[PDB]
């Protein structure tokens, strides 16, 4: 029970560390998804994030939502942010103009 104590703080410490790691990665993806109507650090910081989470930084098989999220986010964030920005200023193309006369 001193080795259940030391074992408890041991695996509690390690799971605290990995919990801090996945907390960091999902925190970064929250920092990505938070950015609406900016579209500029979207591909910058988001593509910086995808270079770590699905990639080498969190490349254990650890979660499902980390794996499916960071594996998914190519087409979702890239295609959705992409065509979001494409139909952005088509709004302005409708707004440019009606002030012709």
């Amino acid at each position: 029970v001193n080795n259940k104590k030391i074992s408890l703080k041991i695996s509690e410490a390690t799971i605290l560390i990995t919990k801090v790691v996945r907390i960091l990665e999902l925190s970064s993806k929250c920092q990505e998804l938070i950015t609406e109507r900016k579209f500029f650090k979207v591909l910058q910081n988001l593509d910086s994030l995808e270079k770590l989470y699905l990639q080498e930084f969190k490349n254990y098989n650890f979660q499902f939502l980390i794996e499916i999220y960071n594996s998914i986010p190519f087409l979702q964030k890239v295609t959705k942010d992409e065509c979001i920005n494409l139909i952005r200023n088509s709004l302005n193309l409708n707004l440019g103009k009606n002030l012709i006369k």
């Binding site: 500029f40 591909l43 494409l86 200023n89 012709i100 006369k101």
Partner: protein
């Protein structure tokens, strides 16, 4: 005023992976062009394409004025 500022930054971020990322704006500009060029003596007709008589002096200064600011 900022009439291509969105098109500017749009073309920047989309031009990280140019250029079909901004090629459909050719289509949207051709379409909403073809609405705004239209019509008033119908005037999406400039693609080898009555309504002639729906035009007079106020419609004239209207028409070539509005097309003039379109060219601007």
């Amino acid at each position: 005023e900022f009439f291509q500022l969105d098109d500017f930054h749009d073309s920047i971020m989309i031009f990280q992976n140019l250029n079909e990322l901004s090629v459909l704006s050719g289509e949207f500009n051709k379409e909403y062009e073809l609405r705004k060029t239209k019509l008033m003596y119908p005037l999406i007709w400039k693609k080898n394409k009555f309504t002639q008589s729906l035009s007079l002096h106020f419609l004239q200064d209207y028409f070539l004025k509005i097309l003039g600011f379109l060219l601007y």
